[PDB]
mmCIF file of C-alpha atoms in Angstrom:
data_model
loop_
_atom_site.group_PDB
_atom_site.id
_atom_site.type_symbol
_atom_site.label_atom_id
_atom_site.label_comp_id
_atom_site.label_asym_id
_atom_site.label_seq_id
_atom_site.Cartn_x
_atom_site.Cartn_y
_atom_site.Cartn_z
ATOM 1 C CA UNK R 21 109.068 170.584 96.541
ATOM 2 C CA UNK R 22 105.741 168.869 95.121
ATOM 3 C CA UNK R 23 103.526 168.416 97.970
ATOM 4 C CA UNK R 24 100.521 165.958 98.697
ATOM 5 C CA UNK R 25 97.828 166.602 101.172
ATOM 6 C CA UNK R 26 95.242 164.522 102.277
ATOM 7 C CA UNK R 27 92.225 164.383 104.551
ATOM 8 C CA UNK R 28 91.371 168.075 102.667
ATOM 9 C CA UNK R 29 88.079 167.925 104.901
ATOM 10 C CA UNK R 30 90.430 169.311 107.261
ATOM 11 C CA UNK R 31 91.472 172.312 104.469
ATOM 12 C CA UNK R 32 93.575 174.747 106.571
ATOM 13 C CA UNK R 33 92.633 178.339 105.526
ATOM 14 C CA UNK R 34 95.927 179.001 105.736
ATOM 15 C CA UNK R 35 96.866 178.035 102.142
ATOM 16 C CA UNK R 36 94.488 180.705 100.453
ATOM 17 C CA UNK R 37 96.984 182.985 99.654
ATOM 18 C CA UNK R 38 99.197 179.989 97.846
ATOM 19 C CA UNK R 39 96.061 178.364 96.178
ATOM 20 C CA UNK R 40 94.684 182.125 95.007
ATOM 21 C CA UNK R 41 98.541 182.399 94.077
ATOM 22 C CA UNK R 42 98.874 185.923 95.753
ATOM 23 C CA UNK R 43 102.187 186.740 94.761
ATOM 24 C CA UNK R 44 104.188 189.348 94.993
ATOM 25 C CA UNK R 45 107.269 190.262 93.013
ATOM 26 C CA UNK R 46 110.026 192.630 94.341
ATOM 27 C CA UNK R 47 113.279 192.578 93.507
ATOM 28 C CA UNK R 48 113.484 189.427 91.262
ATOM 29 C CA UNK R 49 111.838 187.638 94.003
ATOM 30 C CA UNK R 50 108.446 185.887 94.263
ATOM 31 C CA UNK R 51 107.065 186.892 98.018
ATOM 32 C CA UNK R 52 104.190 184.365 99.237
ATOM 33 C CA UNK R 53 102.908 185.686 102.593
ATOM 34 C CA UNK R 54 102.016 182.031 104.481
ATOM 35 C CA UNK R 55 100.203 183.798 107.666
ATOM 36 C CA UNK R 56 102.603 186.317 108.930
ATOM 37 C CA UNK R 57 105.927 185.633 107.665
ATOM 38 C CA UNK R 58 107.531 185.942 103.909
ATOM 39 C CA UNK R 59 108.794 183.238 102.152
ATOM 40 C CA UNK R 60 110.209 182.970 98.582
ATOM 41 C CA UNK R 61 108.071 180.951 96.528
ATOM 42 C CA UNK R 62 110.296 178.365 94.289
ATOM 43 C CA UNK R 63 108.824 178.108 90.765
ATOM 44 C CA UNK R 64 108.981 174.615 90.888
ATOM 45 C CA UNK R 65 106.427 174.416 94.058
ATOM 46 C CA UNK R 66 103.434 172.109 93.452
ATOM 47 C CA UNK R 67 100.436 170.931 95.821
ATOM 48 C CA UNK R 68 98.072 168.236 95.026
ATOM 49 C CA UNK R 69 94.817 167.930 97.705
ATOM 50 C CA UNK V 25 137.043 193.137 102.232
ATOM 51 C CA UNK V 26 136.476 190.755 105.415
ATOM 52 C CA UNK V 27 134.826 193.751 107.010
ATOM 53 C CA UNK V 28 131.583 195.820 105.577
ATOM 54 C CA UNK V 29 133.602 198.508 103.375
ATOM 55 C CA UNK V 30 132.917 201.740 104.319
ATOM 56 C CA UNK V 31 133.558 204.342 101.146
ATOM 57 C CA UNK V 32 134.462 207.983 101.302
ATOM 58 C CA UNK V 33 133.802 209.442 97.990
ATOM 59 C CA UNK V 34 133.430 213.335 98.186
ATOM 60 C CA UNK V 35 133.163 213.570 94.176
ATOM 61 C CA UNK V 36 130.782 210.675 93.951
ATOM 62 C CA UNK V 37 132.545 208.894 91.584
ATOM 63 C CA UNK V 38 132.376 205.389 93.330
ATOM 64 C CA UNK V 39 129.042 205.226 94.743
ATOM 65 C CA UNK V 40 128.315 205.430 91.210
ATOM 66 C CA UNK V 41 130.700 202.527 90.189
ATOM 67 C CA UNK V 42 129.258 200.842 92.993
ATOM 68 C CA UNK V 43 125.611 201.328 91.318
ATOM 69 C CA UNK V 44 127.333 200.290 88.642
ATOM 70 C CA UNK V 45 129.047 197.442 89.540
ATOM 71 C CA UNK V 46 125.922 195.935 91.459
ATOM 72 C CA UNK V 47 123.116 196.588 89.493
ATOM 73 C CA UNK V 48 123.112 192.937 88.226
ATOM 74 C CA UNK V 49 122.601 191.611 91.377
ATOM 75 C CA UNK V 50 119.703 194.404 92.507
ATOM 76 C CA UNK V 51 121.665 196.878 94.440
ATOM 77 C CA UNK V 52 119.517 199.338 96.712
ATOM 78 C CA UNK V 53 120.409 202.994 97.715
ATOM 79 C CA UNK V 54 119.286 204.057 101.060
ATOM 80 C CA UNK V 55 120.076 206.437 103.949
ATOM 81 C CA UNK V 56 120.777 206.179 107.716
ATOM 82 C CA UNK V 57 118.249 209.530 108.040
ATOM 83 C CA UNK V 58 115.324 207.637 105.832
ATOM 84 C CA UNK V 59 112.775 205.728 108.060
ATOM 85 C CA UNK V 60 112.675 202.998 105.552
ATOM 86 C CA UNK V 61 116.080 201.848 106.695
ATOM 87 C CA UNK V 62 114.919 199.001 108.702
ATOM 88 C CA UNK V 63 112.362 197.577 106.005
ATOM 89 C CA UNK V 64 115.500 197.903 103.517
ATOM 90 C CA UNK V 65 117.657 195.952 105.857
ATOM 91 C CA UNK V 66 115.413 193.017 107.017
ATOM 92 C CA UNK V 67 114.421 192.091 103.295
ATOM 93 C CA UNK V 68 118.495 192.454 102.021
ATOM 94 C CA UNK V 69 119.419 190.349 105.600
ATOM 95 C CA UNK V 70 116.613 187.714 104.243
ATOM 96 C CA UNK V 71 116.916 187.886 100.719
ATOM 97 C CA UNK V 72 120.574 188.897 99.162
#
């Protein structure tokens, strides 16, 4: 889902992986690792600061 | 099946139709003996 986040003063480190877009593919799916946990990225995923 | 199938194929005929069959969809050989049995399971349990 497009996302919009504001007050980006605040920036969480936590979305360096998805704004460096550290990705990794295995087995036809796209692995983002927010913090500690996997989660599929969705193509269609878009954040605006 | 309702229940996990469990196949006993001596000539190994149908764990290759099962390769076969699968592939499509990303099918993974493993092994009860091989320590990356858990790994293996947690990402099929999470991701198909």
């Amino acid at each position: 889902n497009p996302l919009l986040v504001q007050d980006v003063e605040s920036y969480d480190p936590v979305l360096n992986p998805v704004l460096n877009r550290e990705v990794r593919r295995t087995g036809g799916r796209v692995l983002i690792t927010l913090g500690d946990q996997d989660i599929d990225l969705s193509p269609s995923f878009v954040i605006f600061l | 099946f309702n229940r996990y199938p469990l196949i006993i194929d001596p000539s190994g005929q149908a764990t290759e139709f099962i390769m076969n069959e699968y592939k499509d969809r990303k099918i993974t050989r493993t092994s009860f003996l091989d320590d990356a049995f858990r790994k293996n399971l947690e990402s099929a349990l999470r991701f198909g």
